[PDB]
Amino acid sequence: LVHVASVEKGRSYEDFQKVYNAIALKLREDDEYDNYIGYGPVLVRLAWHTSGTWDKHDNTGGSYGGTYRFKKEFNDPSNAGLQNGFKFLEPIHKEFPWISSGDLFSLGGVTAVQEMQGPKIPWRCGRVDTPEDTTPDNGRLPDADKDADYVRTFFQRLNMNDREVVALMGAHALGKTHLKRSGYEGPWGAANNVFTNEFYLNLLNEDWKLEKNDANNEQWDSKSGYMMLPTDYSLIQDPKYLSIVKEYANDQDKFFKDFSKAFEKLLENGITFPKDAPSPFIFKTLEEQGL
Numbered sequence: 001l002v003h004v005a006s007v008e009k010g011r012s013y014e015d016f017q018k019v020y021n022a023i024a025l026k027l028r029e030d031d032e033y034d035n036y037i038g039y040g041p042v043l044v045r046l047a048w049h050t051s052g053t054w055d056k057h058d059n060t061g062g063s064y065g066g067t068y069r070f071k072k073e074f075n076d077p078s079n080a081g082l083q084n085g086f087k088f089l090e091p092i093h094k095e096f097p098w099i100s101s102g103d104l105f106s107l108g109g110v111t112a113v114q115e116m117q118g119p120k121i122p123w124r125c126g127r128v129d130t131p132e133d134t135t136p137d138n139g140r141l142p143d144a145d146k147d148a149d150y151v152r153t154f155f156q157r158l159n160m161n162d163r164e165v166v167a168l169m170g171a172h173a174l175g176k177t178h179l180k181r182s183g184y185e186g187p188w189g190a191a192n193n194v195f196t197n198e199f200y201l202n203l204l205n206e207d208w209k210l211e212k213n214d215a216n217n218e219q220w221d222s223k224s225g226y227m228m229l230p231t232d233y234s235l236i237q238d239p240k241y242l243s244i245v246k247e248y249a250n251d252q253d254k255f256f257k258d259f260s261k262a263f264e265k266l267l268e269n270g271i272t273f274p275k276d277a278p279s280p281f282i283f284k285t286l287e288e289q290g291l
């Protein structure tokens, strides 16, 4: 099935910058969430999980249809906690009812990365809501207790290569694991609502110990109070991933550029953009606008 991007009728860059801005202003205002981490990280994760159900083999799932709004997908155990991002976006959608669900979930992620001082992420509009029966089944998002071979094979289904995977995983600088949500507990670093390459630095430089958490799952822990999932740790066990981790630990701009590309790509898998579609938008941050 082909999903052709269809611009919300009559809308242009300024309309979507207004949505961006409303997201960004609420991100600033609603700062208490998650022990003052704020909603940035969970909005990034929402964008990823709504996009990461995609299957390149048959174009099922993906960001286009905004299917997270249906109960099968919002109740996926893999999505536990993302309801907080959805609830955040609800008043945004009420103010701007013309935006599609897929466009809003993906734009939330872009807006969060940028407002957290991450790279600019070009973003294209035109996702169109699809019906409840187009919601992908549970089980397409990745397990965390696995090794590098798992990770590499997993991401082939999203058409991501080693560099794209390692770049995307850098988003694990953000937020934290929550025991009741995933069976893992703890942040990955200190700067968890500012977008930086800290994930890579911590992987290489902390002294990690393989421990069991209070849900009886193994995770890697440091004396600084940070953690890594087994799938995170796999990025330094595998020599191909390790090289790339070292690259990003040593070049913040390179990480930014590669993350931006990979994240846009993730958010756009499955969508066909007509030849005469608008160019991707690059939204100004609130800071850049003086707001």
Ligand code: HEM
Pocket (backbone or CB within 6 Å): 041, 042, 044, 045, 048, 081, 142, 143, 144, 145, 151, 168, 169, 171, 172, 174, 175, 176, 177, 178, 179, 181, 182, 183, 184, 229, 231, 263
């Ligand atoms: C092998 C792939 C991955 C696995 C197994 C994985 C697993 C996890 C787990 C278990 C959590 C903790 C959920 C919780 O307890 O709240 C988490 C959080 C998160 N992940 Fe992933 N993840 C992967 C890839 C990614 C990618 C590709 C991105 C986005 C580019 C991403 C962004 C996030 C963010 C931002 C959080 C923090 C959420 C919060 O603080 O609420 N993850 N991930």
